[PDB]
Design a protein around this ligand. Sequence first.
Ligand code: NAD
Ligand code: NAD
Ligand code: NAD
Ligand code: NAD
Ligand code: JUS
Ligand code: JUS
Ligand code: JUS
Ligand code: JUS
Lengths: 267, 267, 267, 267
Amino acid sequence: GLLDGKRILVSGIITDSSIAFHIARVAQEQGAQLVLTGFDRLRLIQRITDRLPAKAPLLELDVQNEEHLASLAGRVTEAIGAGNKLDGVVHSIGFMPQTGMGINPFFDAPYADVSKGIHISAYSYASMAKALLPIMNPGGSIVGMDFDPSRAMPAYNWMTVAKSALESVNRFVAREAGKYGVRSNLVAAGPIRTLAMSAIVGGALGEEAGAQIQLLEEGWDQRAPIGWNMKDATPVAKTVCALLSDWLPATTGDIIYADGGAHTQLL
Amino acid sequence: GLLDGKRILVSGIITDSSIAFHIARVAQEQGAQLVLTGFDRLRLIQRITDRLPAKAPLLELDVQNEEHLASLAGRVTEAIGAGNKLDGVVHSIGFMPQTGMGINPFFDAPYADVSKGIHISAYSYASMAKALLPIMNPGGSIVGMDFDPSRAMPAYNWMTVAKSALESVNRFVAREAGKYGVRSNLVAAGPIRTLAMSAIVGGALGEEAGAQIQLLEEGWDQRAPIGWNMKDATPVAKTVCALLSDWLPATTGDIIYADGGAHTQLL
Amino acid sequence: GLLDGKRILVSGIITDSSIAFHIARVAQEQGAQLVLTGFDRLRLIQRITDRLPAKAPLLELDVQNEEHLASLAGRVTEAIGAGNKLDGVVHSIGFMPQTGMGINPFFDAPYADVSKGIHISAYSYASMAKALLPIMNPGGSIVGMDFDPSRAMPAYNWMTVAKSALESVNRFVAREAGKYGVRSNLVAAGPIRTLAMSAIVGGALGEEAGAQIQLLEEGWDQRAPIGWNMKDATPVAKTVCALLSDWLPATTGDIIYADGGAHTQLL
Amino acid sequence: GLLDGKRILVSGIITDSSIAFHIARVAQEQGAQLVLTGFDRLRLIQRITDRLPAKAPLLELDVQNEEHLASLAGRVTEAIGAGNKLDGVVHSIGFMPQTGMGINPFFDAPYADVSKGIHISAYSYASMAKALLPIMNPGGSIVGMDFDPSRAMPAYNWMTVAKSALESVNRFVAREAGKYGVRSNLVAAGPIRTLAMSAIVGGALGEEAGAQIQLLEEGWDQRAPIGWNMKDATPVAKTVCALLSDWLPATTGDIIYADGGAHTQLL
Ligand SMILES: NC(=O)c1ccc[n+]([C@@H]2O[C@H](COP(=O)([O-])OP(=O)(O)OC[C@H]3O[C@@H](n4cnc5c(N)ncnc54)[C@H](O)[C@@H]3O)[C@@H](O)[C@H]2O)c1
Ligand SMILES: NC(=O)c1ccc[n+]([C@@H]2O[C@H](COP(=O)([O-])OP(=O)(O)OC[C@H]3O[C@@H](n4cnc5c(N)ncnc54)[C@H](O)[C@@H]3O)[C@@H](O)[C@H]2O)c1
Ligand SMILES: NC(=O)c1ccc[n+]([C@@H]2O[C@H](COP(=O)([O-])OP(=O)(O)OC[C@H]3O[C@@H](n4cnc5c(N)ncnc54)[C@H](O)[C@@H]3O)[C@@H](O)[C@H]2O)c1
Ligand SMILES: NC(=O)c1ccc[n+]([C@@H]2O[C@H](COP(=O)([O-])OP(=O)(O)OC[C@H]3O[C@@H](n4cnc5c(N)ncnc54)[C@H](O)[C@@H]3O)[C@@H](O)[C@H]2O)c1
Ligand SMILES: CCCCCCc1ccc(Oc2ccccc2C#N)c(O)c1
Ligand SMILES: CCCCCCc1ccc(Oc2ccccc2C#N)c(O)c1
Ligand SMILES: CCCCCCc1ccc(Oc2ccccc2C#N)c(O)c1
Ligand SMILES: CCCCCCc1ccc(Oc2ccccc2C#N)c(O)c1
């Protein structure tokens, strides 16, 4: 097993399409012992997490909630047992109010909405690192999920800004994590048919932004030298497990692109 | 005159060291007619703006204030006269609470503070574009001030994240501005001895972060193939005027580095 | 005049569509005194250079030719007069054998051909800097022409590799040039209908690479927030003159994108 | 074993410090069956390759030699047996004449020398891909070794240009490789004490370039959030094996930084 003997916390499962679900599945297949965290609808998440290869504790974590964050290391320790620490942490979380995305004009998003999006999508990467680094082993790994925001694009709007902020946060988390002998990296994935995406795609069913999204998806597979299948989160899940393993031990503050190589090609 | 006949709004003057003061000075020398905006201490700003080569209207603008933003185009029109529009807009504004910078630990900044910093330093670039694009001429230019956040560094901390967000915002502002035939770009300047910097440098007088800042300054001039003088904002002011002119007409969504070429050299 | 009183050498004129022709035209309109250099068909070039706003000396320069390079500073000095030096130098030169481009398979280009292309397109930027820096004034400017090679693309093939090398050469030329108080930068232009392009486009009239090139052109104007007109070299010529002026005095080793902002947008 | 059952060709072994030696060692520990290639001093290389965990065929390959390249797939097939194909290929090869590096002035390198360096260090990545892709399995992986050339630096000089070219070549190799279901990536390593480096460091023992190299090494470990040990090629070897494995299946045309995260930090 790639992750045999490792204890890994995975946030972000909401459906069986969640990138986090597939990260969790592949990690368990590779021998990892998981602790899962979920937001809002815990009973629902439990039903999904029951479909994984193996049992795992499920803890509540709303990254907006300072009490949840303050108690997290303690609750995790209770789950994995005193004297044990985490080897990995996966941040697979994001949010942006509907005003900040889709067909909504970029200029019409109130800062209150943008700020909430940045809180959950970017700042919380630092929040989770702050909470969990004190219970991580040397050689450990923190991984977050990114969508390449180096260029602007239709529809993604303020989430692009939140991802740009996340990339910057990741470089600073790496400075802190290094003191614990821990790496911090992001995986920039290509588009995957998840609940999050269905909210975006669904919000523009018939408008120009919806058409633009479909064009972006077609262009992605065309540009990717090895192609890109939006229906398959496995290549992304494997990439996250690679960073969680001991096989990328000199990479930190960085971004690994699991996108079919699309970002390396203009056309 | 490089900017002969152009009407240009300049935000961000607070002292005679302000990058905005030097942008304003050089622009007037090149024939521009200015409208200035100021925050908080208007009487003080007036005293400084009296030391410019020419007279210019001074309007109050707190970019946190939705009423100030909603009335800005109207107030500007009153200043420059009905039937007239702006050819340029300079955003030279930034803020980050003390908890988000200096020697303060990266993990100890409350999101309330980070959010305020991002509001003023990044979101407000979009706010100003939204307010002013309806009164800009085709061929016009919006310019904001940046500090290269591509890599993490000591002390700059959450302001780095705010600049990463600003770069992303600028790429989206360019999409909107293009509909008006208007360009949007940032100037990434090297370090300049201003009031803002004095707040940072001063906040660490004797701590490791203070030493790190001095090291960064020495490294900057060393790396710059043409050198770098932190005591001189003129090269930066000229670069902004270049983007405000008609001489970079095919550049938008972009970043021009006025940093002595330091970002192009490793050592 | 933007370049009033400046003495500027411009290489690369071959037809009235040459980017160099338009750089030369705009520079003269802005008061520059030019020295032109030409390759191979000097009588032909003379006929074109006669259509510029003002007269200018024309010197032969084959950048492959070590004797031409060794005598260049001397020949230029003879042209502009003893005691006078250059304020600017424009490298607007490129070449790649047909085996290295178009529909030709990437793997089928012999190194002898690739090497010749890199010699003329990249190494010669250093050659010209070496020859001319000893006769340049402090505050001077060297500018070369680039086509963004950060990502691979159809048809451009080995020329992309040559441009990647040129970008690297430019960063090293900046180190040397800085000793003379001289800047070195590239302008990355979007596609322009020139003789060079006609050789590429023409070499694939009816093949997949030809179709791919047309798609790239359509995508360019779509992505550019201010649009892109391939029939108009003026915005590019103005950008080069901006770098030749005193208005970008803190930029060196760098690349300015005159591409309608296309490189800042994914779609 | 990470690479259990995979057949992998590894070029570039010359001493027990060679990055390729450590790639080969770690790959064998992970169950790979290797084919090694060597240049010039085959008896010497044999003596070193005898110190690996397991036996492996050693074939002669001078990447300058068109006959060696034309016969390589045939010779490899003879080594691994008819009906068998390669799963991996490692390019760990570089060369630059002494005129192109060290204390030698950048402008004094003859193109004949630069061209030879680019041939071996960059073009040959395409040469090896061309020769070996016809005998690679789908899901296969080609990996080359890089040193981040995004910025100029002392001493590395024309090798920096060769690496910039290599990065561009890699993006085009990925386009070709994708047709075979094969990935192509580079690993950008931090500095490692090898024979190659000893040639550079040794060539400046007492000159400014030698001092600059020592400063670069100290700065590297300082900037790396997890530190950097130039005496240890293992983290780099593991990173290459990660790309050779099935665990980064959606990454191609790309660069993975095994540098302690140094390239993500300014200071
Ligand atoms: N689906 C894609 O195409 C794609 C591509 C690149 C990157 N990503 C990123 O991958 C990650 C997961 O996205 P996904 O596509 O699997 O979507 P998803 O809908 O399956 O999962 C997103 C998760 O965010 C969690 N979340 C939202 N608010 C939270 C809060 N206040 N506290 C704690 N958790 C909260 C949700 O509960 C949910 O489980 C995100 O960072 C996303 O931006 C997705
Ligand atoms: N000084 C440097 O080294 C340096 C380097 C690169 C970029 N910058 C950027 O240049 C710009 C100007 O900085 P400066 O160095 O001239 O500092 P400065 O102190 O001289 O000016 C900063 C301005 O921000 C304005 N501001 C703060 N909050 C505001 C609000 N709520 N509404 C409207 N205005 C507000 C201030 O009133 C002030 O005039 C900033 O974006 C800064 O980050 C500075
Ligand atoms: N046309 C575009 O779309 C475009 C876009 C971006 C960058 N560029 C670059 O702009 C520059 C000029 O290209 P252009 O489009 O105006 O093409 P052009 O055909 O009008 O000019 C190219 C020049 O290269 C010169 N040249 C070729 N070999 C030479 C040698 N051995 N010695 C001296 N000069 C030599 C030619 O004589 C010619 O004048 C090149 O570097 C090119 O790659 C062109
Ligand atoms: N050592 C470092 O610090 C470092 C850092 C980043 C990247 N790299 C890269 O790693 C790779 C290997 O370098 P290394 O440090 O292990 O040095 P090395 O001296 O141990 O190996 C370099 C190899 O190049 C081979 N080579 C040279 N000319 C050849 C030719 N004509 N045909 C076939 N092979 C030839 C040599 O025989 C040798 O085995 C290179 O691409 C190098 O640039 C090294
Ligand atoms: C123009 C867009 C086309 C391709 C989109 C790929 C993509 C899909 C879903 C993503 O997830 C979120 C998106 C927005 C808000 C919250 C989340 C979360 N969690 C993501 O980040 C990127
Ligand atoms: C590690 C740092 C060393 C060099 C710093 C250069 C620099 C100085 C001042 C700057 O201005 C601000 C900084 C923080 C918060 C608000 C503003 C404002 N306005 C800036 O953005 C960058
Ligand atoms: C896929 C391509 C589509 C757009 C191309 C834009 C473009 C056109 C012409 C160019 O000039 C050359 C090209 C090749 C060889 C020599 C020269 C020269 N001189 C260039 O560099 C870039
Ligand atoms: C300023 C430099 C300090 C750090 C250097 C790291 C480094 C060391 C050795 C390298 O290998 C070569 C270098 C030159 C020519 C051939 C090869 C080969 N093979 C390399 O690419 C990079």
